[PDB]
Amino acid sequence: LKKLWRFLKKL
Description:
55% helix; antimicrobial protein
């Protein structure tokens, strides 16, 4: 549970 996956998809 962290917005890291969102950050990765935005990379």
